[PDB]
């Protein structure tokens, strides 16, 4: 594979270069929210973000070296995790608010417009405060997001040996960035540990957000795009 020959700085450049753009919502600020209006906006935004995510995944070093179904399995298992860590990253400079889209900035009170949404909101806001407290760097963020893609579904399958090698390469890249920033050896593995334990929580928010979507689908509050239903059926 070509991803193993990459250097740490070259790994960083490829990840930053593949970053998906920040999309806008269909929001109209003369429409105070109902429940179906907010859920429709959130699902419409997620649908358009998934399209950019798929083309982002193919630009993650080592991801194309996987078979087609293995690429499908990883994205099916990690898509909501990847959306959420991107949302948390966007909201870093907005304490107490979730930046879904530049024209869609919601706080904790807006979440009550949907049954059970405020519980997910507070978890998302807690992750944003943690990134802000740790002063997470963009180079670290794109490494964490790549780790989610390769790790979330790897134990749910030679292809794993390749994935574990690429994962080790991202770890070397994370340590490489922390060494550049002047962190000592003890600070490096401590910060490395602090970053990776976030993934346990992002995984937890994804499972909770996955069941919330399945209920809103079953209760039929808002219809869903076929692609979003396929990603959602993959978790049931």
């Amino acid at each position: 594979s070509l991803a193993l020959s990459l250097t740490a700085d070259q790994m960083v450049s490829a990840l930053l270069d593949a970053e998906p753009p920040i999309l806008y919502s269909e929001y109209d600020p003369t429409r105070p929210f109902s429940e179906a209006s907010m859920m429709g906006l959130l699902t419409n935004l997620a649908d358009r973000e998934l399209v950019h995510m798929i083309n982002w995944a193919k630009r993650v070093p080592g991801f194309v070296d996987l078979t087609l179904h293995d690429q499908v399995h990883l994205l099916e298992c990690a898509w909501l995790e990847i959306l959420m860590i991107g949302l948390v990253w966007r909201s870093m400079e907005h304490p107490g608010k979730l930046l879904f889209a530049p024209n869609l900035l919601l706080d904790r009170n807006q979440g009550k417009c949907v049954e059970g949404m405020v519980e997910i909101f507070d978890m998302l806001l807690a992750t944003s405060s943690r990134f802000r407290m740790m002063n997470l760097q963009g180079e670290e963020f794109v490494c964490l997001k790549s780790i989610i893609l390769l790790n979330s579904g790897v134990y749910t399958f030679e292809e794993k040996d390749h994935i574990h090698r690429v994962l080790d390469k991202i770890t070397d890249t994370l340590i490489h960035l922390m060494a550049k920033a002047g962190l000592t050896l003890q600070q490096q593995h401590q910060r490395l540990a602090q970053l990776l334990l976030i993934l346990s929580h992002i995984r937890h928010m994804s499972n909770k957000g996955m069941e919330h979507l399945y209920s809103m689908k079953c209760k039929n509050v808002v219809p869903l795009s076929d692609l979003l239903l396929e990603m959602l059926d993959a978790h049931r």
Partner: peptide, 9 residues
């Protein structure tokens, strides 16, 4: 197989 199609293109 929508996810399959977007990964090919």
């Amino acid at each position: 197989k929508i996810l399959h199609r977007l990964l090919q293109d």
